[PDB]
Enzyme design. Sequence first.
Site, PDB file in Angstrom:
ATOM      1  N   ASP A   1       0.765  -1.182  -0.054  1.00  0.00           N
ATOM      2  CA  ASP A   1      -0.124  -0.030  -0.058  1.00  0.00           C
ATOM      3  C   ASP A   1       0.898   1.262  -0.028  1.00  0.00           C
ATOM      4  O   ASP A   1       1.908   1.373  -0.120  1.00  0.00           O
ATOM      5  CB  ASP A   1      -0.975   0.041   1.128  1.00  0.00           C
ATOM      6  CG  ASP A   1      -0.315  -0.153   2.604  1.00  0.00           C
ATOM      7  OD1 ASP A   1       0.456   0.607   2.739  1.00  0.00           O
ATOM      8  OD2 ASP A   1      -0.325  -1.167   3.285  1.00  0.00           O
TER       9      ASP A   1
HETATM   10  C1  LIG Z   1       5.074   4.756  20.255  1.00  0.00           C
HETATM   11  C2  LIG Z   1       3.637   4.811  19.759  1.00  0.00           C
HETATM   12  C3  LIG Z   1       3.301   6.336  19.212  1.00  0.00           C
HETATM   13  C4  LIG Z   1       1.820   6.384  18.711  1.00  0.00           C
HETATM   14  C5  LIG Z   1       1.746   7.753  17.891  1.00  0.00           C
HETATM   15  C6  LIG Z   1       0.307   7.668  17.249  1.00  0.00           C
HETATM   16  C7  LIG Z   1       0.079   8.931  16.133  1.00  0.00           C
HETATM   17  C8  LIG Z   1      -1.121   8.908  15.525  1.00  0.00           C
HETATM   18  C9  LIG Z   1      -1.339   9.885  14.508  1.00  0.00           C
HETATM   19  C10 LIG Z   1      -2.601   9.757  13.437  1.00  0.00           C
HETATM   20  C11 LIG Z   1      -2.844  10.650  12.425  1.00  0.00           C
HETATM   21  C12 LIG Z   1      -3.876  10.373  11.695  1.00  0.00           C
HETATM   22  O1  LIG Z   1      -4.928   9.784  12.172  1.00  0.00           O
HETATM   23  S1  LIG Z   1      -3.999  10.737   9.883  1.00  0.00           S
HETATM   24  C13 LIG Z   1      -5.472  10.089   9.166  1.00  0.00           C
HETATM   25  C14 LIG Z   1      -5.340   8.988   8.464  1.00  0.00           C
HETATM   26  N1  LIG Z   1      -6.395   8.587   7.729  1.00  0.00           N
HETATM   27  C15 LIG Z   1      -6.736   9.408   6.525  1.00  0.00           C
HETATM   28  O2  LIG Z   1      -6.198  10.293   6.180  1.00  0.00           O
HETATM   29  C16 LIG Z   1      -8.036   8.997   5.622  1.00  0.00           C
HETATM   30  C17 LIG Z   1      -7.585   8.412   4.152  1.00  0.00           C
HETATM   31  N2  LIG Z   1      -7.040   6.958   4.344  1.00  0.00           N
HETATM   32  C18 LIG Z   1      -6.020   6.624   3.593  1.00  0.00           C
HETATM   33  O3  LIG Z   1      -5.890   7.361   2.567  1.00  0.00           O
HETATM   34  C19 LIG Z   1      -5.488   5.109   3.766  1.00  0.00           C
HETATM   35  O4  LIG Z   1      -6.622   4.142   4.402  1.00  0.00           O
HETATM   36  C20 LIG Z   1      -4.166   5.194   4.526  1.00  0.00           C
HETATM   37  C21 LIG Z   1      -4.062   4.029   5.243  1.00  0.00           C
HETATM   38  C22 LIG Z   1      -4.242   6.590   5.170  1.00  0.00           C
HETATM   39  C23 LIG Z   1      -3.131   5.319   3.293  1.00  0.00           C
HETATM   40  O5  LIG Z   1      -3.571   6.037   2.087  1.00  0.00           O
HETATM   41  P1  LIG Z   1      -2.900   5.787   0.709  1.00  0.00           P
HETATM   42  O6  LIG Z   1      -2.097   4.594   0.732  1.00  0.00           O
HETATM   43  O7  LIG Z   1      -4.078   4.983  -0.137  1.00  0.00           O
HETATM   44  O8  LIG Z   1      -2.098   6.842   0.157  1.00  0.00           O
END
Ligand SMILES: CCCCCCCCCCCC(=O)SCCNC(=O)CCNC(=O)[C@H](O)C(C)(C)COP(=O)(O)O
Lengths: 115, 112, 208, 88, 386
Positions: free
Chosen positions: D43
């Site tokens: 991905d």
């Molecule tokens: C040590 C532990 C530390 C933990 C830290 C935790 C930090 C968390 C921060 C999280 C920030 C967010 O949520 S960021 C929000 C993330 N989700 C989106 O943006 C919606 C669209 N989803 C998509 O595009 C795909 O499912 C995707 C998998 C993203 C890939 O995409 P592609 O491949 O098609 O490009």
Amino acid sequence: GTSVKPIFSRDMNEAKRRVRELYRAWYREVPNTVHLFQLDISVKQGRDKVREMFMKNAHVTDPRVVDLLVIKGKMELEETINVWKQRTHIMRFFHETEAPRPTDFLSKFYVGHDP
Amino acid sequence: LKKTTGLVGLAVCETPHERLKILYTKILDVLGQIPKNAAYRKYTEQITNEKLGMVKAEPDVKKLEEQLQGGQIEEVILQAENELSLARKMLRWKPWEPLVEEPPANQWKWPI
Amino acid sequence: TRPTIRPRNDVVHKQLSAFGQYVAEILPKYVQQVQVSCFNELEIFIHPDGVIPVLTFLRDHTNAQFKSLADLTAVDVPTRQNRFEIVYNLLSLRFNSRIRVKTYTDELTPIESSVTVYKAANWYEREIWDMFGVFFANHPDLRRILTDYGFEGHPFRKDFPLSGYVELRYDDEVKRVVAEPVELAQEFRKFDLNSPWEAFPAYRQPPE
Amino acid sequence: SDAPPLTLEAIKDRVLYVLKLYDKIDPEKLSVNSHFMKDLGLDSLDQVEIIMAMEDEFGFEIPDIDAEKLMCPQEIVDYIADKKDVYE
Amino acid sequence: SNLTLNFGPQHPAAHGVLRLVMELSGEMVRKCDPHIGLLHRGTEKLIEYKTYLQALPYFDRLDYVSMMCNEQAYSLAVEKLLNIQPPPRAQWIRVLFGEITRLLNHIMAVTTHALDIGAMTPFFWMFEEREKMFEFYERVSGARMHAAYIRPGGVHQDLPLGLLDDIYEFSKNFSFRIDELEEMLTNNRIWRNRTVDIGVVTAEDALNYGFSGVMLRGSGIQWDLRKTQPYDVYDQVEFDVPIGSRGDCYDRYLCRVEEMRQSLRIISQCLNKMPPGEIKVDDAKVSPPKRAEMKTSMESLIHHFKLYTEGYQVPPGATYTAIEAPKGEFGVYLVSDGSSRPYRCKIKAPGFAHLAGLDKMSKGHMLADVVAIIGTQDIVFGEVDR
Ligand SMILES: CCCCCCCCCCCC(=O)SCCNC(=O)CCNC(=O)[C@H](O)C(C)(C)COP(=O)(O)O
Ligand SMILES: COC1=C(OC)C(=O)C(CC=C(C)C)=C(C)C1=O
């Protein structure tokens, strides 16, 4: 039109670009977090945990929500880099003292009333 | 002649009549570019013209401070500079245009 | 009517009404409403886009000179399409007066930061971001101020539970403080207090 | 003297070596023309990790663009050759 | 890179729970980053879950060095929303105890400031006076500091028969204690070296940063809420407002000492002019009836029952009410939806804005200078965190 105004991104492409930049920053930071906080986990465990958090909000299709999620993730990264967080805060992502709860109907029927 | 205006960071101004004249003339020049029917232009022009008229009619600083009712002529100069900056910003903003985007039906209804 | 009832002042009411009309006349692009409460407090309801101009006018105008920002907070009303109400309280030392400026936003609409107008806003906006989740654009450094590091949610929202979702304790197996779902030995007891009879006829709402 | 003059073959070898050090790609199915999205079943985030590994190995940073469109080893090799101005 | 240091929360000079993250070059302070919320208890939501009488004790614990002043501010806000008026004796008692509370707060501030700078004795000299004022508090309310004495109807109870004499006895001698503290500090060259030209702030910056109280008056701003916007009977007393000229720590210390003297003056005036009469509003739909009436008459029992179970309803509306608390302007933005429980209660603490300006005030100073600047801002974190 629905007449809504943006935060940063115009559509989902720019939002995905910001998501990728945030993911790159977190991936780079993980080994430093393992070293500085003296964590007993491995770097692979930390990067898997980082990957897991991103996947949770993968479903969202609104650019404003994605923008706010990226802002929150950058805030969390800033907290981690400056060691404003402590070891307990970092380890709270792993839920190490929470007993596992079965998702099957029989297990839930046996323990209690909650669905 | 006066020393220690009494406010930290506010220096004593020598030749304040000339400074006030320059500031009021600049304010009037800036207001001249705003539409005639705009309320900000006419209100600010009125008050600035009164202040300039009372400035040109008094050579004594203490009595000028008493007449302006503006609190220690150095603060009058500071307020004139603030007004000039605001006039430039308002020329940029043009807030005399009609209202944009009336609020939703019950946005301001209280209680609930 | 005399001893127990608060006296009212009509000179201040007239002056505040005149100044409200003045501000509304000068800024028709952003001012949606002006009100004077009967205990002599003046409020101005504006469109969000005019947060920066209006405030700037009030701060720098010769006739206004509201140079002190006393307070900046938010109110959450879930029944409104725009959930959050942003309230600025300003004080003019030159004219010994107070004014209130109100606007609105929802969860996904940023409000312009007013740090360029008032330095004092810097922390207040941070608090609004922490407690309500309202984002401020062009804020020099926006992050949580009151909550614990990594805290999830905005506790001052009406739908946020009073005791929250997590609680802390010390665990000896991992030798550290850990967080777990809230469990209360005694549940907080909800009281139903409102009388079924109307108290204030002057505030009765039409029966729709 | 400095490092020896880098050639296209060395760049290809290093790229393939990095790619088969990725635990999510089987070494035998990987070829210089294999597509990450389709042939390998990776991905977007896996592609980001691969680009970061390339960044680490070749010691230079690839922006978000000019990297979002590298979808097979051959494109990575071509991009590295162009940045390093290598013709042999 | 600069050295990063955690100043507090477990630090003698942190004034409680404060995480000052400092960036230092040697002992020069390059940056101050105050981290707060270590005493954030979520007071405002809790108030949203209480009646107006039930929420009053929270204001005791907001600024736990000036309790009755917070009670007065909250009571004034509720009175304004209720369109009712406290009786004159209650207002005079309110002003008297507000000035006593200001004395307590100023003693705490000055003595702990000197303790942080390195002078420990005046703390011990003045805390005996603090204990005597605590005795006054307890004799009027039964509690030494969290009195819950000032309420939106006036005051809970009338004075005991011998209290004014003892207050007069304390007041006729407090000025010598002030003189001894002044002899210890005011002309000492070490104190002046540690205070003069430290933490200078201009009048314009103080106004724009949201400062209030002494933090304005030390820079020459002629502002005082008791003189410009009086609330209870402050228009019937005579006193002077001390004004500084340098805007530094030393001028603010002098201002606080002079304010203690002016508080003694006001207390004398209040003692001489205490009038007779009832101590809460004669309106049983707001203020509870007397116990004897509650056990005798039907209406009194009904109103007692309803005021202690459901509480009085407040007409809908929003107010911002501010007072000149000993630490600066203390305010309440109170919103009523018509019921017996407030819809929203935002608390404005002067220490919030004062601490937000710490980084500006510390430019070009050292660690000990920053300790002095922390002391000069008069910060209690119960009100800062809420
Ligand atoms: C040590 C532990 C530390 C933990 C830290 C935790 C930090 C968390 C921060 C999280 C920030 C967010 O949520 S960021 C929000 C993330 N989700 C989106 O943006 C919606 C669209 N989803 C998509 O595009 C795909 O499912 C995707 C998998 C993203 C890939 O995409 P592609 O491949 O098609 O490009
Ligand atoms: C003189 O000995 C004492 C201290 O050491 C200097 C303290 O810190 C304290 C605590 C007060 C400061 C502000 C930390 C007290 C009460 C005390 O008596």
